[PDB]
């Protein structure tokens, strides 16, 4: 698109998760990525409504990002966003109704 790094930066967690899952499946077996995915989903299913900012403490502990700072944490603060939609529309969009 506009820049070579735009698509790479947008999809980084997904690629990292895919690489870790592939390595784990090749080394140990099918059970470990299954358990990791189920834990991720379980801890991610609880959080604030989409029009308010969350913290993601348990998910960060599970992923291991609780002792690391990146450029996503110091640039363009998502908590102090300059635009936000209507609450009901955001909640309906998260549910797939739109």
């Amino acid at each position: 698109p506009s820049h070579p790094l735009e698509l790479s930066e947008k999809n980084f967690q997904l690629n990292q998760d895919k690489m870790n899952f592939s390595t784990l499946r090749n080394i140990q077996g099918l059970f470990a990525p299954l358990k990791l995915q189920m834990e991720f989903k379980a801890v991610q299913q609880v959080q604030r409504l989409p029009f308010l900012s969350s913290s993601n403490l348990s998910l960060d502990v599970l992923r291991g990002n609780d002792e690391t700072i990146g450029f996503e944490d110091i640039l363009n603060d998502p908590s102090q966003s300059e635009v936000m939609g209507e609450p009901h529309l955001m909640v309906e969009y998260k549910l797939g109704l739109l």
Binding site: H3, E6, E67, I69, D73, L75, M90
Partner: protein, 213 residues
């Protein structure tokens, strides 16, 4: 995405197309645009008997940890941001662990973070420090490659300083001799000369870690 999706942080790629058109348009109309600040002066480093000597001419010697220091060349903002981020990460690591950090950890962090952005962040670094294992010296390039060498040079007067080292470098030197060699090699490329000395005798690896001032 959509106006109904929550926002996310990080870099922004919104002005790319407009800038791409504008730069060519101004080029073919004959107007100038602001640029970025760059540094390209000579930096060197030598491994002596029980420490590391880092030198630069005029500060360009950054702080990473009480036992690790760095020098940079290229775009100033990139070097500043990378050094600050790595220093913060190493401080968090030391607080969690309770011991002074290792040079290999900093080298690995810098390698991975420079490789993630495919060389678009222009920062060439010279890294040195003293560990429980001993003194180590590295050299990192903007694309994400590293060399572990007993002496390195970067900048404009690289050839003269490298010649001085290849002519006059011997293993297991002294502090004064290493400092004199670094100063002579730096002066061979050209202001003043700035020297940083890291010594094993002034570091205690047995006491618990405390946050430095």
């Amino acid at each position: 995405v959509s106006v109904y999706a929550p926002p996310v942080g990080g870099f922004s790629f919104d002005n790319c197309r407009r800038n791409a058109v504008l730069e060519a348009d101004f080029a073919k109309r004959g107007y100038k645009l602001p640029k970025v600040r760059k540094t390209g002066t000579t930096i060197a480093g030598v491994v002596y008997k029980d420490g590391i000597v880092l030198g630069a001419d005029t500060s360009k010697i950054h702080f990473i940890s009480p036992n690790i220091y760095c020098c940079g060349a290229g775009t100033a903002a990139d070097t500043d941001m990378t050094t600050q981020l790595i220093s913060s990460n190493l401080e968090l690591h030391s607080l969690s662990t309770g011991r002074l950090p290792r040079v290999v950890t900093a080298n690995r962090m810098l390698k991975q973070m420079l490789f993630r952005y495919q060389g678009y962040i222009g920062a060439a670094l010279v890294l040195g420090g003293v560990d429980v294992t001993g003194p180590h010296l590295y050299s990192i390039y903007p694309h994400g490659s590293t060399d572990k060498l007993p002496y390195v040079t970067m900048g404009s007067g690289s050839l003269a300083a490298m010649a001085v080292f290849e002519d006059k470098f011997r293993p297991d030197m002294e502090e004064e001799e290493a400092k004199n060699l670094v100063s002579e090699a730096i002066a061979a490329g050209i202001s003043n000369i700035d020297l940083c000395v890291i010594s094993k005798n002034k570091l205690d690896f047995l006491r618990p870690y405390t946050v430095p001032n």
